[PDB]
């Protein structure tokens, strides 16, 4: 199966800073990578799909990039509501898998 | 001309259909399979005077003008005959006018009934793009 | 409005099986897939499997033998059945709608605890 390696496990940053999360796949996922944000006590919410497309209502400060086996989510000048967890998930054939998650925390 | 699924997938990607309006490439290859079975010369006369043409079966009452269809709107502003070529440009360009948003692929009955709900990506896996 | 809600046993005997229901609304199950995802308390998301709009199913490789997903389109319900409940199956279970390779709507989830 294709496994996703998401780094870092945690991120400590302040509002206004710009952060990056990577997700590399054990095999080519041909752009079928999505990102989710999950706040404490809530269900994951779609942020980005097919590598670079922002979901409806998602602020442009978020941008996804990548191809083949390497992908990343960038949050430009993060805001209070960005704090929480992020997970990447691939959709190339089955089974699907998620990255290990990243906890974005207030510094 | 009868396209192979991979050959068509590659051509449609080169023409900007990959994730166009949020529709993954497989949707377009699937729709072409069920609409024209990958044949660029495909034609189908409907019960109402309109006829569908080319790889993506463009309708002559609404999108292309065949000059034989009553109520012809010609929204793609193109002769239907221009849509029966080995080169999929004209057909892709009209399909892009058709799909103005993320519900637009419903324009193809074959897609809504036979592709929607299925693993459309299956049509492109193993294809070099 | 697209909605999904999970319903389940809550606590199940490891000497028993599991059955979770996902009731949807605002869309036809025939046109969208529905994935099952779990998350042990304080942990990450784990993909369990999915049932496509056309009824085909695919499962997590390692859990495939214990998993079974099915649905009733007319009743707008998707079911997850899991057998051989180890204590490690304790988690919050979610069902999410898949729209063209992205899980766009998620239920709030249902917590499951594997007892003794």
Chain B interface includes A92 (CB < 8 A): yes
| B21: nearest Cα among B98, B84, B87 | B98
Q: 3-class DSSP state for residue B13?
A: helix
Q: Annotated catalytic, B7?
A: no
What is the extent of the structural domain holding A83?
Answer: 1-107
Q: 3-class DSSP state for residue C3?
A: strand
Which experimental technique did the depositors report for determining this structure? X-ray
CATH assignment of the domain containing B67:
1.10.530.10
Q: Which two tokens stand for residue B12?
A: 């449609």
Number of domains in chain A: 1
Chain B nearest CA to A100, separation (Å): 25
Using alpha carbons only, how large is chain C's radius of gyration in Å?
A: 13
Around Cβ C38, how many Cβ atoms within 10 Å?
24
Residue C74 has what DSSP assignment?
G
Number of domains in chain C: 1
What is the extent of the structural domain holding B100?
Answer: 1-129
Cis bond before residue B49 (omega within 30° of 0): no
Around Cβ C35, how many Cβ atoms within 10 Å?
24
| A95: nearest Cα among A27, A47, A35 | A27
What is the extent of the structural domain holding C78?
Answer: 1-116
Using alpha carbons only, how large is chain B's radius of gyration in Å?
A: 14
CA-to-CA dists, residue A106 to A10, A13, A83, angstroms = 11, 5, 7
Chain B interface includes C98 (CB < 8 A): no
Is B87 annotated as a binding-site member?
no
Pairwise CA distance, residues B81 & B41, whole Å? 10
Q: Which residues contact C96 (CB under 8 A, 6 or more apart)?
A: A43, A44, C4, C34, C35, C37, C103, C104, C105, C106, C107
Residue B123 has what DSSP assignment?
G
> Nearest 5°: phi and psi at A37?
-120, 140
CB contact under 8 Å between B125 and A32, yes or no, is no
Cis bond before residue A95 (omega within 30° of 0): yes
CA-to-CA dists, residue A22 to A48, B74, C101, angstroms = 14, 47, 20
Nearest 5°: the CA angle C34, C36, C38 is 155
Number of domains in chain B: 1
Pairwise CA distance, residues C59 & C35, whole Å? 10
Chain A interface includes B14 (CB < 8 A): no
Q: Which of B35, B48, B66, B119 is catalytic?
A: B35
Q: Which residues contact C20 (CB under 8 A, 6 or more apart)?
A: C6, C7, C8, C9, C36, C79, C80, C81, C82, C93, C95, C110, C112
CB B88 within 8 A of CB B55: yes
Pairwise CA distance, residues A28 & B126, whole Å? 11
Q: Which residues contact B7 (CB under 8 A, 6 or more apart)?
A: none
Pairwise CA distance, residues C26 & C97, whole Å? 11
Q: What is the resolution of this structure in A?
A: 1.8
CB A9 within 8 A of CB A100: yes
> Nearest 5°: phi and psi at B91?
-65, -40
Q: What is the DSSP string of B63-95?
A: TSB-SS-TT---TT-SBGGGGSSSS-HHHHHHH
Helices (H), A1-107: none
CB B118 within 8 A of CB C52: yes
Chain C nearest CA to B68, separation (Å): 35
E strand intervals along chain A: 4-7, 10-13, 19-25, 33-38, 45-49, 53-54, 62-67, 70-75, 84-90, 102-106
For the beta sheet containing B51-53, the strands, ordered from the edge strand earlier in sequence to the opposite edge, are B43-45, B51-53, B58-59
Which of A44, A51, A85, A90 to probe the C interface (max C CBs under 10 A)? A44
Say how many CA atoms lie within 13 Å of C17 toward its Cβ.
10
CA-to-CA dists, residue B86 to B24, B38, B42, angstroms = 23, 11, 11
Q: Which residues contact B2 (CB under 8 A, 6 or more apart)?
A: B37, B38, B39, B40
Question: Chains near B, with 3+ CB pairs < 8 A?
Answer: A, C
CATH assignment of the domain containing C20:
2.60.40.10
| A96: nearest Cα among C23, C103, B19 | C103
Q: Annotated catalytic, B35?
A: yes
For B112-115, the CB contacts below 8 A with 24+ separation are B112/C31, B114/B30, B114/B34, B115/B27, B115/B30, B115/B31, B115/B34
């Amino acid at each position: 199966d294709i496994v996703l390696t998401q780094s870092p496990a945690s991120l400590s940053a302040s509002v206004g800073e710009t952060v990056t999360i990577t997700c590399r796949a054990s095999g080519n996922i041909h752009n079928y990578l999505a990102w989710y944000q999950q706040k404490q006590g809530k269900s994951p919410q779609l942020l980005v799909y097919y590598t670079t497309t922002l979901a409806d209502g998602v602020p442009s400060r978020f941008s996804g990039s990548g191809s083949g086996t390497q992908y990343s989510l960038k949050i430009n000048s993060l805001q209070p509501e960005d704090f929480g967890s992020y997970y990447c998930q691939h959709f190339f054939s089955t089974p699907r898998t998620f990255g290990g998650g990243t906890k974005l925390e207030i510094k | 001309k009868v396209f192979g699924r991979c050959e068509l997938a590659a051509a449609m990607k080169r023409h900007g259909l990959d994730n166009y309006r949020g529709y993954s490439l497989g949707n377009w290859v699937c729709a072409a399979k069920f609409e024209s079975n990958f044949n660029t010369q495909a034609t189908n006369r409907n019960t109402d005077g309109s006829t569908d043409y080319g790889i993506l079966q463009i309708n002559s009452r609404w999108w292309c003008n065949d000059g034989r269809t009553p109520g012809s709107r010609n929204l793609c502003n193109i002769p239907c005959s221009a849509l029966l070529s080995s080169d999929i440009t004209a057909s892709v360009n009209c399909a892009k006018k058709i799909v103005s948003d993320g519900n637009g692929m419903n324009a193809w009955v074959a897609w809504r009934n036979r592709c929607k709900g299925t693993d459309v990506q299956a049509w492109i896996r193993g294809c070099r793009l | 409005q697209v909605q999904l809600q999970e319903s389940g046993p809550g606590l199940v005997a490891p000497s028993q099986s599991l059955s979770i229901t996902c009731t949807v609304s605002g869309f036809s199950l025939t046109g969208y897939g529905v994935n099952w995802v779990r998350q042990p308390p304080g942990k990450g998301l784990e993909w369990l499997g999915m049932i496509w709009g056309d009824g085909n199913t695919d499962y997590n490789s390692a859990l495939k033998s214990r998993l079974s997903i099915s649905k009733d389109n007319s009743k707008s319900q998707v079911f997850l059945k899991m057998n051989s409940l180890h204590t490690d199956d304790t988690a919050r279970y979610y069902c999410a709608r898949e729209r063209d390779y992205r899980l766009d709507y998620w239920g709030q989830g249902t917590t499951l605890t594997v007892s003794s």
